Amino acid sequence: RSRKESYSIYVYKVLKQVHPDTGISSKAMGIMNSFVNDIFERIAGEASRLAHYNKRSTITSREIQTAVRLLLPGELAKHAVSEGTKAVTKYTSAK
Amino acid sequence: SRKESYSIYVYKVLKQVHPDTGISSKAMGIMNSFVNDIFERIAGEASRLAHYNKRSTITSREIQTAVRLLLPGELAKHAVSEGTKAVTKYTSA
Amino acid sequence: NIQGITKPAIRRLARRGGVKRISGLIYEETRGVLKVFLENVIRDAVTYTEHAKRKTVTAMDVVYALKRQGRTLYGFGG
Amino acid sequence: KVLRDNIQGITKPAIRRLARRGGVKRISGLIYEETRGVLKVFLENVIRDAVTYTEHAKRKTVTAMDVVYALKRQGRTLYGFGG
Amino acid sequence: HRYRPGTVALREIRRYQKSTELLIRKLPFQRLVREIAQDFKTDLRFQSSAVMALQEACEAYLVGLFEDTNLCAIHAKRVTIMPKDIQLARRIRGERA
Amino acid sequence: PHRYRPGTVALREIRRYQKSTELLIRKLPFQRLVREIAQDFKTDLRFQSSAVMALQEACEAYLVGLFEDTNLCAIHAKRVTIMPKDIQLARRIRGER
Amino acid sequence: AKTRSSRAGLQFPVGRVHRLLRKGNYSERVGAGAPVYLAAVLEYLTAEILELAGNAARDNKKTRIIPRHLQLAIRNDEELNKLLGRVTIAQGGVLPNIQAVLLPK
Amino acid sequence: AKTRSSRAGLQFPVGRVHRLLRKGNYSERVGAGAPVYLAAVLEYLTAEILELAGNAARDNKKTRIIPRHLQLAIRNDEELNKLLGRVTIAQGGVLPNIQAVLLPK
DNA sequence: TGTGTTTGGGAATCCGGTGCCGAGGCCGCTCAATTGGTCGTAGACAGCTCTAGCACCGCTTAAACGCACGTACGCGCTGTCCCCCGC
DNA sequence: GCGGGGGACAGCGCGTACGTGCGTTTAAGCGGTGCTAGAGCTGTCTACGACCAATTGAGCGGCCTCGGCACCGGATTCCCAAACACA
C-alpha cells in the first residue's frame, strides 16, 4: 500500500465554508485537486524564477506575492494579495 | 564583473563549418540567446523527467529523452546520433 | 484504421463547435488533422514510457505529453 | 512633464509601412485606429509585467532584461537583447 | 412530415453543446491509438484511463478547431465550412506551416 | 504627365519593406507612448534605452505577424483590402483577448 | 500544540505546502512566511472557484458539484477564464454558444 | 590535464555545462554523461544554424552573417522553423512573400 | 399577389416514483507535522562610486498632412446549378 | 440512397473610398551640454532558516449508511411548418 497525497479534505472544508449545504462529486474533487496542484506549480515555478533572477537563494513571501501578481489577472491578483498578506499578518502577529 | 557567453565556441563551430565567413556582434548576441534558450529547455525537461520518475540524478539518458521530446524528427535523430557518439568516445578514453 | 472516425462522429464534433452546415470534403481533412494530432501526442507519451523502463502507457504519461504542447488536462491524476 | 495622448504618434504612414511588411496591398481607413488599439493593449500587457519585475528588484529603472523576461513569460521570446 | 433544412442542424448544435459525454466511439479510437503507437514502439499496453485521457484531449482539440473553422466560414460570408476554412484556422493558430 | 495605376506602388512598397529590416515606427513617438503607458503603473520610472528598443522590436514583430494573419483572413474572404473585422477575427482565432 | 494552518487562520495545510516547496527543488531555502502566503493564495482561489461552481450547480437544481459546473464557472468568469485558458477539463463540455448569423430570420 | 570537451571531441565546454546544471537546481545529482550529451546536442544545433546562415549570407554576396541571414536560415528550414517558431529575432525582418492573389493578372 | 395568424404535431421539458451506489461520517492506526534547541550564513542595511537616464537647445530635412483627382474594388443584386441536409 | 432546396459561386453594375502625386508644414533625428538619480558593488552583523531528536494528533485507509442523482414513464409545453384567411 503506497502513500497518496491529495487536497480532498481541505477542498471539502473550503466548500463547507462557502456553500454549507452543497457537496462535491469525486470527479469534481479530482479536477479541483488537479487545479490546485497546477496553480501551486505555476506559482512556485514563477517564484523560483524570481528568486533565481535576482541571484537570490531563498523563496520569501515577497517572491510569492510578486509571482501572484505576475500570474493572476488584475482584480484576482489584488484580492489574492489582500488575502495572503492578511494571512501572513495574522500568522506573525500571533505566536 | 565577469560575464558569461558562448561567443568563442560559436565562432569556433562556425569556422569549422564555413572557414571563410565572419559574424556580426548582433548575430553573436542572437546565437548566444538561442544556445541559452535551448539549454534551459533541455535541462528543464530533463529535470522534469527525473522528478516525475522519482529519480534523483540527471544522466545522459535523461538528456537523450529530453532531446527526443524537444527536437523535431530528423533533427532529433541526428542530435541523438551525435550525443551517443560523444558519450561513447568520452567513455572509451 | 483512421476510418473508425466515422462521418457522424465528425458531424457531432462539429455540432459541438457550433457548425450549422458541413461540406463533404471536411471529413477527410478532419481525419488527417486528428491523426496528426494523435501522432504528436502518442509519440511523446511513448517516449515517456520508454524512458521509464515501462512497457505500459499510463494516463499520467498522456497527461505530461499533453502538458508538453500546452494542452493541460485536468482530471486524470495530474 | 506629464505625458498625454501619445498614441497619435503612431501615424497612418507608419501603420501602412507595418502592413506592407506584412504583405498587405490595400488598407481600409478604419484599420489605423484598430491597430492603435491592438498595439496599446499589447504594450499594457508587456509593460505591466516589466514594471512588476522592476518593482520586485527594488529598482526604479526598467531594464531591457525585464522586458525580455516579461516577453518570454508571455511565450513571445525575443533574441538579441541579452539573456 | 419534413423539417426545414438546417433546423435539425441547430437542434443538434444545442443538444450537443448542452451535454458533456464523448462524441467518438470508444473502441474505434482505442484501435486507432494502438495502431498509431505500433509505429513508434511495438507491443505496447495501454491502461484504459490512458486511452480515456487521449480521447478527451482529442475531442477537445477537434471542438476548438471546429469553433475556429466556424469563425472563418462566417467571415467569408458563408454558412458551410470548407477545407480551406480548416487550413486557414490551423495556419493562423500556428499548427500548419 | 505620368501616373501609375492603383496598386503598382503598393507592390513596390511591399517588396521594399519585406526586403529591408529597419524599424517602421518612429522611435520618439513610440518612446513617449511607452513612457506614458508605464506612468499608469508607477510614477517616476526610468527606462534603459535598450529596454525601449526591445519593446519596439517586439511590438513591430507582433504587429507584422498580426498583419500577415489579417491579410490571410481578408484574402480568405475574397477581398484585397484588410478591414478591422479581419484584425478582430485574427486575434480571436489566435486566442488573444 | 496548534498547527501552523490554525495559527495563520487558514484551512489549507501550511506544513504540507512547506514540505512540497522544500521537496520540489524550487530553491535551496524557504522562508517562514512563504508557505503561509502560498496556502492563503490557494485557499482564496479555491474559495472563488467553489463560490462560482456552487452558484452554477444551484442554477441546475443540483446540490452536488460536477465537472460540468466547474467548467461553466471557469468559462463564465473572465479573470478565471484568462487564468485557465489553455486548460481542458475532463467531462467538461463547452459553453452554449451559437453565432447570431446561423439563427434563422 | 586535458579538458572534458577535448576527450569527447567537442567544441562546447563540457565542464561549464556541468557547472550550470549543478548550479541551476535541476536535480540534486548530475550524471557524468549528461553534460557531454548536452554539449554535443548544443554544438550540433549551433553548427546546423551557422551552416544555413552562412549559405544564406553567401547567397547575398555577403561575407558576414547578420540577424537577417539568421532569420532567413531559420524561416526557410522547416524543422528549425518548428523549433524556433515562437521566437522573434531583433532586426530580423520577414521572408519575402506576396500572395499570388495580390499580383496583377 | 401578397401579408399575417392559427393548428396538428413532433421534440424538449417537467414531475413523481424508485432504487442504487458513492459521498459523507466514524474508527483505528501511523507517520509526518510540531517543539525546542544549535549553528551557520543569506541577506538587510549602510555607504560609496560613477554611469547612463533625463531635460534642454538648435538646425536640417525627411517625413507627415491636407488636398485634388481618378479608377478599381467592395458590395449589393440576380441567376443557376449542385451538393449537403433531412429522412 | 434519394429528393430538393438553399447556399456557393458566377456575372454585372456603380459609386465612393482608397491609391497616387504635389505642395506645405511639422517634428523627428542628430549633435552637443549638463545634471543627478539611481544602479551596482562592498563590508558587517544579525536574525532567520536548516538539521536533529522526541511527541503526538491530524490525516489516511477501511467499513458502513442513506440520500442525491440517474433513470423511466407519463403529462406539459414549446416551437414549426404549413396553411388558409383575407386585403
Numbering used by the authors:
A (entry chain d): 28 to 122
B (entry chain h): 29 to 121
C (entry chain f): 25 to 102
D (entry chain b): 20 to 102
E (entry chain e): 39 to 135
F (entry chain a): 38 to 134
G (entry chain c), H (entry chain g): 14 to 118
Question: Which passages does the manuscript contain on this structure?
Answer:
In chromatin, linker histone H1 binds to nucleosomes, forming chromatosomes, and changes the transcription status. Here we report the cryo-electron microscopy (cryo-EM) structures of transcribing RNAPII-chromatosome complexes (forms I and II), in which RNAPII is paused at the entry linker DNA region of the chromatosome due to H1 binding. The nucleosome is composed of linker DNAs and the nucleosome core particle (NCP), which folds an approximately 150 base-pair DNA segment into a histone octamer, comprising the four core histones H2A, H2B, H3, and H4. H1 binding to the nucleosome induces structural changes in chromatin, thus regulating transcription processes catalyzed by RNA polymerase II (RNAPII).
In the form II complex, the exit linker DNA is released from the DNA-binding cleft of RNAPII, and the chromatosome arrangement relative to the RNAPII is rotated around the entry DNA axis by approximately 65°, as compared to the form I complex. Considering the nucleosome rotation angle, RNAPII may have proceeded ahead by a few base pairs in the form II complex, as compared to the form I complex. Therefore, the form II complex may represent a snapshot structure of the RNAPII just after it escapes from the paused state in front of the chromatosome. Intriguingly, in the form II complex, the RNAPII clamp may directly contact the H1 globular domain because of the RNAPII progression, as compared to the form I complex. In the form II complex, the RNAPII progresses a few bases ahead by releasing the exit linker DNA from the RNAPII cleft, and directly clashes with the H1 bound to the nucleosome. Finally, the steric conflict between RNAPII and the chromatosome may be resolved by peeling the nucleosomal DNA at the entry site.
